[PDB]
Amino acid sequence: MDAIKKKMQMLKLDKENALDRAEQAEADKKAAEDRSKQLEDELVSLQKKLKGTED
Amino acid sequence: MDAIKKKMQMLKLDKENALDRAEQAEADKKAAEDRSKQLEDELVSLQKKLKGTED
Amino acid sequence: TTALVCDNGSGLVKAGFAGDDAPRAVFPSIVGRPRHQGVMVGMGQKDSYVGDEAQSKRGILTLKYPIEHGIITNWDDMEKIWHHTFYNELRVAPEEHPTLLTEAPLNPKANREKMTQIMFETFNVPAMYVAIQAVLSLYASGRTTGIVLDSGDGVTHNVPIYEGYALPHAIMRLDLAGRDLTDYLMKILTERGYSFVTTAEREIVRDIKEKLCYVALDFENEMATAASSSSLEKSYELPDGQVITIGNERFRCPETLFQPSFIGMESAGIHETTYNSIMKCDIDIRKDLYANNVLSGGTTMYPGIADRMQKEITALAPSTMKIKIIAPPERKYSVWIGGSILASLSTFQQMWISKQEYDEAGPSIVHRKCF
Amino acid sequence: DFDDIHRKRMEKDLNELQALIEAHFENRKKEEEELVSLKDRIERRRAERAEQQRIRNEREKERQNR
Numbered sequence: 001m002d003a004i005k006k007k008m009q010m011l012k013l014d015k016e017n018a019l020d021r022a023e024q025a026e027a028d029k030k031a032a033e034d035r036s037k038q039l040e041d042e043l044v045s046l047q048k049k050l051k052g053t054e055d
Numbered sequence: 056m057d058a059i060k061k062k063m064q065m066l067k068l069d070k071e072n073a074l075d076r077a078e079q080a081e082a083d084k085k086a087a088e089d090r091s092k093q094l095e096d097e098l099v100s101l102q103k104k105l106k107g108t109e110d
Numbered sequence: 111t112t113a114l115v116c117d118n119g120s121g122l123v124k125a126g127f128a129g130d131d132a133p134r135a136v137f138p139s140i141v142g143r144p145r146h147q148g149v150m151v152g153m154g155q156k157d158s159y160v161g162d163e164a165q166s167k168r169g170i171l172t173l174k175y176p177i178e179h180g181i182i183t184n185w186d187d188m189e190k191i192w193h194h195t196f197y198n199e200l201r202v203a204p205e206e207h208p209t210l211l212t213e214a215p216l217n218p219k220a221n222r223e224k225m226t227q228i229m230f231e232t233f234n235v236p237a238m239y240v241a242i243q244a245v246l247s248l249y250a251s252g253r254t255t256g257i258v259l260d261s262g263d264g265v266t267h268n269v270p271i272y273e274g275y276a277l278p279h280a281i282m283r284l285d286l287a288g289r290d291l292t293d294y295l296m297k298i299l300t301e302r303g304y305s306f307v308t309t310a311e312r313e314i315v316r317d318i319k320e321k322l323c324y325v326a327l328d329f330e331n332e333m334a335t336a337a338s339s340s341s342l343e344k345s346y347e348l349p350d351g352q353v354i355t356i357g358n359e360r361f362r363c364p365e366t367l368f369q370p371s372f373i374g375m376e377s378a379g380i381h382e383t384t385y386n387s388i389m390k391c392d393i394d395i396r397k398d399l400y401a402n403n404v405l406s407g408g409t410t411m412y413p414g415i416a417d418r419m420q421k422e423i424t425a426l427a428p429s430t431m432k433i434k435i436i437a438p439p440e441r442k443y444s445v446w447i448g449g450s451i452l453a454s455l456s457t458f459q460q461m462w463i464s465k466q467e468y469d470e471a472g473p474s475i476v477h478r479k480c481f
Numbered sequence: 482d483f484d485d486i487h488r489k490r491m492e493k494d495l496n497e498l499q500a501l502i503e504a505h506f507e508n509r510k511k512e513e514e515e516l517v518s519l520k521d522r523i524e525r526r527r528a529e530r531a532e533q534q535r536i537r538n539e540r541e542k543e544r545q546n547r
């Protein structure tokens with residue numbers, strides 16, 4: 001009819017916005033966790049270098 | 056009718072799924088970010104003690 | 111006073127006062143002289159019916175569009191259309207209102223100069239300004255970056271913009287548009303027996319195209335499905351009865367957009383000229399253009415085009431970039447809404463081409479600083 | 482920029498839906514029930530006209546039959 005189509009369009013705009021936000025948040029999590037794990041690896045290498053210096 | 060109900064329910068389900076997924080991702084992002092901050096703070100002190108050891 | 115935001119277009123003239131949401135009067139731009147003899151005396155028969163009046167008497171007229179591909183080929187008819195638009199559809203004399211026409215990119219200069227000369231001499235407006243049809247469609251989306259594909263009815267052009275700085279070397283204008291799709295649909299309907307020839311029946315084929323055709327997500331699978339089942343055959347009732355059944359002509363008519371080899375055009379589809387237009391841009395603004403691809407114009411209203419185009423570009427583009435296609439529901443009037451917004455701005459109020467300036471430099475003022 | 486999208490979108494996102502629902506409800510209420518009731522009324526009047534026509538036709542055929 002008439003109002004039904006507009007209501008469907010609203011329900012679809014919510015769909016697109018929610019899905020896009022979810023995808024963007026997932027990409028953010030991937031990037032942040034990669035950052036953290038690379039920092040942890042750098043910390044490990046520093047520990048090993050400290051061990052060599054102690055030797 | 057029949058089509059309106061199923062389509063509307065499926066679209067609302069899609070919106071809710073995307074929202075909850077985004078919230079989970081953002082929570083993990085915040086936790087990883089704070090842990091990364093902890094890693095930075097500990098790494099600086101590790102570098103300082105390494106520098107003293109080298110001196 | 112208020113400004114008149116006219117938008118000539120090619121196929122539908124959209125006009126209205128600046129500051130509203132939708133154009134006040136939208137009507138086809140056709141001028142049709144009668145072709146038969148006429149025997150009733152005193153019937154009050156005019157010599158040319160323009161606008162929406164000639165879509166009701168089209169049975170005994172020979173409709174002819176005054177704008178072929180963006181450019182204007184018949185200046186007297188265009189003047190008649192403008193006169194009708196001002197006096198009968200809006201009923202505001204042009205002596206007291208600025209006007210904001212719109213023009214496709216890469217159009218001949220003489221067209222624009224003649225347009226401004228007409229507006230200043232015949233209608234005698236206070237001040238008029240000509241704007242590129244894609245920047246307005248970018249205004250209406252509320253963005254400030256993005257590459258807009260404005261597939262009108264006359265000409266499809268693809269203007270990339272970043273941070274408000276247009277890139278003049280990356281505009282890809284292609285002359286396939288809604289009219290060629292109408293002609294191709296009228297040409298493939300003959301494969302079932304329905305022959306439309308008269309210039310009046312082109313309107314019927316246009317209505318068929320608007321109401322039935324859709325863009326297929328995957329072309330070969332649809333061609334295979336329509337050739338086995340019969341779940342696609344949708345029927346339509348002509349203006350006199352004798353319903354017709356459209357089979358796989360439904361998604362073959364608008365497929366011409368993505369494969370212009372169907373109508374013999376050499377160039378690549380609208381899915382690949384956008385990627386080429388992006389790749390001509392600098393290497394650092396390609397991500398933003400990828401993420402803010404904007405659709406506009408009437409012909410981009412086919413059901414299922416915002417998914418086919420996204421699939422195609424995602425196939426072409428690098429796998430890391432995110433491809434997003436902005437397809438607002440108010441696509442058809444996007445250019446005019448943007449025009450209203452631009453005319454309503456205070457910062458823009460001193461960019462009009464004032465009449466005294468035209469009197470001092472002639473019609474060639476439009477190419478000068480007042481663009 | 483991009484701050485008028487809220488003030489031009491969110492408005493009609495709810496007001497338009499509610500207003501169109503109101504329009505549909507009032508139009509259906511005004512139209513369907515009244516039309517069915519009026520058609521039933523006209524049908525009853527039509528049946529009465531049919532009875533009157535039958536009576537008049539029969540009496541005239543009775544008299545005129547010679």
Ligand SMILES: Nc1ncnc2c1ncn2[C@@H]1O[C@H](COP(=O)(O)OP(=O)(O)O)[C@@H](O)[C@H]1O
Pocket residue numbers: 118119120121122123261262263264288289292316319320321407408409411412442
């Ligand atoms: N709902 C629709 N579905 C498919 N095609 C459409 C639809 N509406 C308009 N069109 C096509 O778009 C054309 C109108 O385009 P428009 O944007 O008015 O051109 P212009 O840029 O000259 O104003 C029509 O000729 C028609 O072929």
Ligand SMILES: [Mg+2]
Pocket residue numbers: 119120243260262263407408445
């Ligand atoms: Mg246009």
